[PDB]
Swiss-Prot record, chain A:
Effect of Q863K: In MRD61; uncertain significance
Protein name: Mediator of RNA polymerase II transcription subunit 13
Residues annotated as signal peptide: none
Effect recorded for A867V: In MRD61; uncertain significance
InterPro entries on file: Med13_C (IPR009401), Mediator_complx_sub13 (IPR051139), MID_MedPIWI (IPR041285)
Reported tissue expression: Ubiquitous.
Quaternary organization: Component of the Mediator complex, which is composed of MED1, MED4, MED6, MED7, MED8, MED9, MED10, MED11, MED12, MED13, MED13L, MED14, MED15, MED16, MED17, MED18, MED19, MED20, MED21, MED22, MED23, MED24, MED25, MED26, MED27, MED29, MED30, MED31, CCNC, CDK8 and CDC2L6/CDK11. The MED12, MED13, CCNC and CDK8 subunits form a distinct module termed the CDK8 module. Mediator containing the CDK8 module is less active than Mediator lacking this module in supporting transcriptional activation.
Pfam families per the UniProt record, alphabetical: Med13_C, MID_MedPIWI
Record motif LXXLL motif 2, residues: 421-425
GO terms under biological process: cholesterol homeostasis; positive regulation of DNA-templated transcription; positive regulation of transcription by RNA polymerase II; positive regulation of transcription initiation by RNA polymerase II; triglyceride homeostasis
Subcellular location field: Nucleus
Source organism per UniProt: Homo sapiens (Human)
Disorder this protein is connected to according to its UniProt record: Intellectual developmental disorder, autosomal dominant 61: An autosomal dominant form of intellectual disability, a disorder characterized by significantly below average general intellectual functioning associated with impairments in adaptive behavior and manifested during the developmental period. MRD61 is characterized by global developmental delay apparent in infancy with mildly impaired intellectual development, expressive speech delay, and behavioral abnormalities, including autism spectrum disorder and attention deficit-hyperactivity disorder.
GO MF annotation, one: nuclear thyroid hormone receptor binding
From Swiss-Prot, chain C:
Signal peptide: none
Subunit structure: Component of the Mediator complex, which is composed of MED1, MED4, MED6, MED7, MED8, MED9, MED10, MED11, MED12, MED13, MED13L, MED14, MED15, MED16, MED17, MED18, MED19, MED20, MED21, MED22, MED23, MED24, MED25, MED26, MED27, MED29, MED30, MED31, CCNC, CDK8 and CDC2L6/CDK11. The MED12, MED13, CCNC and CDK8 subunits form a distinct module termed the CDK8 module. Mediator containing the CDK8 module is less active than Mediator lacking this module in supporting transcriptional activation.
Tissues/organs with expression: Ubiquitous.
Subcellular location as annotated: Nucleus
Coiled-coil regions, chain positions: none
Organism: Homo sapiens (Human)
The protein's role, per its UniProt record: Component of the Mediator complex, a coactivator involved in the regulated transcription of nearly all RNA polymerase II-dependent genes. Mediator functions as a bridge to convey information from gene-specific regulatory proteins to the basal RNA polymerase II transcription machinery. Mediator is recruited to promoters by direct interactions with regulatory proteins and serves as a scaffold for the assembly of a functional pre-initiation complex with RNA polymerase II and the general transcription factors.
Disulphide bridges: none
Family: Belongs to the Mediator complex subunit 12 family.
Disease: Opitz-Kaveggia syndrome: X-linked disorder characterized by intellectual disability, relative macrocephaly, hypotonia and constipation.
Gene: MED12
Name the UniProt record assigns to this protein: Mediator of RNA polymerase II transcription subunit 12
Amino acid sequence: SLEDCHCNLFCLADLTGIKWKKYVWQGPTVTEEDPILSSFSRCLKADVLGVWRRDQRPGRRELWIFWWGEDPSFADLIHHDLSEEEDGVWENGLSYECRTLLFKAVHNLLERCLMNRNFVRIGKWFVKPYSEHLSCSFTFFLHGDSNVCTSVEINQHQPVYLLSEEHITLAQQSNSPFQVILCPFGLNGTLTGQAFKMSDSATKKLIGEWKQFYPISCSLAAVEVLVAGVRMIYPACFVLVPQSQTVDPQSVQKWVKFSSLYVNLILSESVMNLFKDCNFDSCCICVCNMNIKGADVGVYIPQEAQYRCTCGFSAVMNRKFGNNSGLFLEDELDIIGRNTDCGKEAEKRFEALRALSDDLILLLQDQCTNLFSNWVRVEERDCCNDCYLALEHGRQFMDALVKSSCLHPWSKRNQCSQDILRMLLSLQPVLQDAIQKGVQGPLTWQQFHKMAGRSPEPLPIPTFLLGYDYDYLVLSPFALPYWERLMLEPYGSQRDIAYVVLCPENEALLNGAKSFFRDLTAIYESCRLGQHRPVSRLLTDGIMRVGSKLKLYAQVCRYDLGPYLATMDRDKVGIPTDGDSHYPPAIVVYIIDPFTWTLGLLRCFLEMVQTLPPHIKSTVSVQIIPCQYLLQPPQHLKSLAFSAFTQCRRPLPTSTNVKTLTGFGPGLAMETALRSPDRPECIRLYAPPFILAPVKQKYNVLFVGYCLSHDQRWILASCTDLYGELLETCIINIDVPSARKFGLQKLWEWCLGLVQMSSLPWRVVIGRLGRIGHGELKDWSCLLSRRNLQSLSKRLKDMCRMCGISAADSPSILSACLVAMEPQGSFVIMPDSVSQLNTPQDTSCTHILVFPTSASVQPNILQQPLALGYFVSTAKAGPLPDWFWSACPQAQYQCPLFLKASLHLHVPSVQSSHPLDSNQTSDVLRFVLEQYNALSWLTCDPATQDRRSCLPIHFVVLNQLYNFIMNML
Amino acid sequence: NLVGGMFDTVQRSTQQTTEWAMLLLEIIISGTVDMQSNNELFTTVLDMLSVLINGTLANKRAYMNLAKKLQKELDSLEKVRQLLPLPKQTRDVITCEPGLQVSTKQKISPWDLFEGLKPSAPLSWGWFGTVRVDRRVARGEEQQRLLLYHTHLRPRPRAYYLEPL
Amino acid sequence: VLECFEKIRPGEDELLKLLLPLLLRYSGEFVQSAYLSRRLAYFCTRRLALQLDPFSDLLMCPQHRPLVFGLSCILQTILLCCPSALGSPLDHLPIAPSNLPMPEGNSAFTQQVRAKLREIEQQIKERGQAVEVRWSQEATAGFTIGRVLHTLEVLDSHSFERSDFSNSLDSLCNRIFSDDDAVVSLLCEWAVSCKRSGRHRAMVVAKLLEKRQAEIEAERCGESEAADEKGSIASGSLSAPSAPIFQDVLLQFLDTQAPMLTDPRSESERVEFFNLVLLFCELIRHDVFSHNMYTCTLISRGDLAFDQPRHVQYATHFPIPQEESCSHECNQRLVVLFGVGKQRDDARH
Ligand SMILES: [Zn+2]
Ligand SMILES: [Zn+2]
């Protein structure tokens, strides 16, 4: 159980009873002369929450003061020319503007308290200069109705050393430029070596102004340093100097052969001033003015008049996710900008990424249907882009090199459970004294679930459906290793398989196969799956032989397999015949691969599909195995057996054998309606070895998941049922030399194709493996609206009569929802810390917390997060795409994996209680997610003790065909 | 530095080897020293422990005698398990006992799991919460028979999607 | 399985070829126990000594080609996964496991693991030394006292009536053996002693050290004399060409040990003071010490001094035997060290 393990959340304070005042200054189109900063340093020494920033109007800056209870002294901390324009309390409602302005204000005091306690700051990191010496990163968000919390990201870094007189001496004797860390923001520059003394009058006025904002110690005082080609005088106290699995591959490799105050002032306004709520990370296009730019981003990103953007959209934070994650290429260029920089670099990367038959691509999606199978970041440049504006302003004060190496590479270069929580206990009195001038320590997940005001139990394990006797059987998933022991019977009623084996003329390689497939005959038949007998004609026990050399392998593949696939009864006297009374076996060809592009073996299947009669070719499956399985090694035999039994896909019978012998009747009526040309052919009904057990009108819910390929050429989708009784997928191509509306349109008639082959009303839930961009949702909302689903309801009543009478037989859609799926990467929990069975070594568990995530506490598309919930799981995940984890790749390798799911449409009651029909935004999360947990439990390989990965099967099978199209094309 | 000295006196006795084998196990298993504090300490503290138990051989009977006294109490765990003998292994089953949570784990020898006897003799059906439910037709199968009277719109021939725009 | 592997007759390769895949199939569980790993490594290493009596000669034989490769890889993967099993089996192997033959293919895979074999083999090399020293006066102040207990024994027990080739000061200095700067603090306090006496010892310590301070440092001074031109700072100092590098600042060990050492009223410290001034005299006589900086320290002590203080007691009572050398070094130093007043000229008279 993970209810009692520690995660990294510290409850800071409460927003209840808070009071704030906003002050305004208008200036022309000097630090003590500046009324904004003189009041800012004065209140910072007063230990009250303060934050300053600019506005859309030039020469216009503001101050914010936050406090609880008794007001501070306002007759001295505020300049004479300063005036107020806002006086707000907690009970009057908080905007999103005032919500994140606390987060910078609490960080203003928290940075100052950290500098007093022998910690130094490099950008977004705080580390102790010279394991118990680690760098920590702070971000702030509001969880619950009024509660404020923070999360600490702790990463291992190389040790850093403070600058002293010793390093200056070797710097002057060094002919090469000497590389040091500059500023609280981690700038990279060259130390020339001109040290300064505290008795100098030049540094005397310098250290007096520096102490007003930054708490500096109190002899060496300053040093001349050159950064980005510009020399600048800086205090030496803030200058820093840095220090400057295997066995398995070998085994098989064996087996191959023998077988500067003004500079930091401007940099504080745009680099550390962007601390937003992490619950808004799944954000989208603005609802207030319907733009990809809004709020106060227009002074941070380089007009149009956005008027009071009250939603939580921030285009700065949004851009980071947009640059390298799975997104539409039209939408990707909107977030970057075709006119501005790096839009040409993304176009070049896509075009270099690209630089065949239609039926062969269809073959690729059949084999992966079953259960069992560089680029620089944008805000790395944006900080370097803000380096140019800050350095130009500071050089004006005194009267490609900047964008290249402005910031130090110490932050971008790179554990245990006990040492991290030791630092978490160490940080606890620091944050407690920061607010008191209480704080909960390391929260458990039970504490996190309690504090939200909403079950803290782990989510229950759903059962399956099997059969021990001829009847059905509800079973736990833990009896899956005991399939042949309990001799259970699956769905599908024991389909029999006849097989052909393709093998070269190597004698040592020949004998390993005939031992393998006879044992494969045993494991398929010891388990209750039918008969694994070969082709009934005797050809060296069902194995045929053949004979760069692939052309020789292909001629006899084509010239032989074509036409091949195209009265005494002693013991029958004691028993009588039963009578005339009332299914062909599956044909799956087995192919061995001597190669260690291998599409040439698959080119046989393109030749066998065409040169056969339709009755033979309607059910033909292809099986590929490597040749190294025969020679060098259990769990392999049963896994290959259940995959082929899944891929049989038994077709619906076309002949019904009524033998009515009458000119007309009801027996001929269903016979005639079955052979009508508007019925499709080759239904290929799907029955897995196990389906989801039912949970106590008649309805059905579909789960569909889609994501793009490595290029933007292909959109790949897969769909499942509520109980997982159906498993279908599709490939849709969009290639251009408008362009994105047609691809999203083409997916939906395929989605409408599956529901209209049923005849009960449906409920639709769309999953996206990637992140929903700004332009996808415009198509997803417009054509899948309330009116249009009512429009197709009137249309479907036309061609089908009984859809007109009974609505329960019409396969319409009752409600529509969209869920985006993306990682969080902010919080971490360790299972080793406690407060009869320990969880992660032997089993998996899943815990959920959800919330409505209202924009403030106080047309067709509402707010960008309708509701959000976290998906943490002890179960590990499989191979994810690269663009999935380009957001925060440091959270990939932790075993309890954090996921972030949001809501985007939530269209209830189209035909006008079900959990999806409720207008409460929290309930529609907590319906689909435990079924998402349920379909994740259908991914259990019976050769594996647990499920082979996390995530639902429609996401996994989509990744099973994404990795196949990665490797093979 | 002390116990490296009279280590040659330790192997003179037999039971005093085991009396000094157990006291240092409490130190290593309690996490008083870890890898990040001193890598070289774990290199040292197992080196005489390698030949502490080799001194039992140079009898085999005494070797299993103190071995059964050391797995009984229990990356750091990987190193201490390298010196001790290869243990016998028993098959594990995870028991739910229900909503439906997980409760316990039972260990069973693999010599009992055979298909000769018709019911589950070493396995309890109440471990799994097994429910016998009656036979019903497939829900997809009855949808095909129910589809025969509607004659809805034509589905795509699955190659229409793989076309240029 | 390891009992089955020790019964193969030597020089026969037609049985261990078919038993070679038995090694690889069970290799996943040998690394979990060191005693099977120790038993196989002593089995593996003793086999490789047979086929050597170079490795490319066995590669052309198809019978011998998998044998040398398969026995090489198993010993490689034991130490990478279970290094606690290695006085050691590797002592019988004349070839290191780092440059031991490896299977072909990816060189980047092979060069990555070749760095991995050698850093673990170095780690197990220093660990085996720690076993053989049984995990063990190495304290520096203890070694200094450890030098006190033994150098004083080998010099007090040595007579001085005969300066034989065994008792010669060329042989006495070498039989003693930073620690060079610690023994000169040890040899000096030997000669000042009140318990044992005889100024034959006092002549030895000056003559043990007048020539040794200029003959073993001058070998390294000429190395420093060629590489002393590094920019303006080294040119601004020019320590080596101005004067040769010489052993110095040994005077600061001896000025501390005299609170009021100017009296004969206490009998033990009187002969301590009597030895002290003659020892200071014979360092100047033989030019034992760096007298260029020996003078300047007492000038600095004389200048910064202002029942009399001991630094005034030092320069008043130290006998310099270097007479009529230079008036700017000897004569003008004797005048300025005793204040202002011309009553000292009558005692000069
Ligand atoms: Zn807005
Ligand atoms: Zn219909």
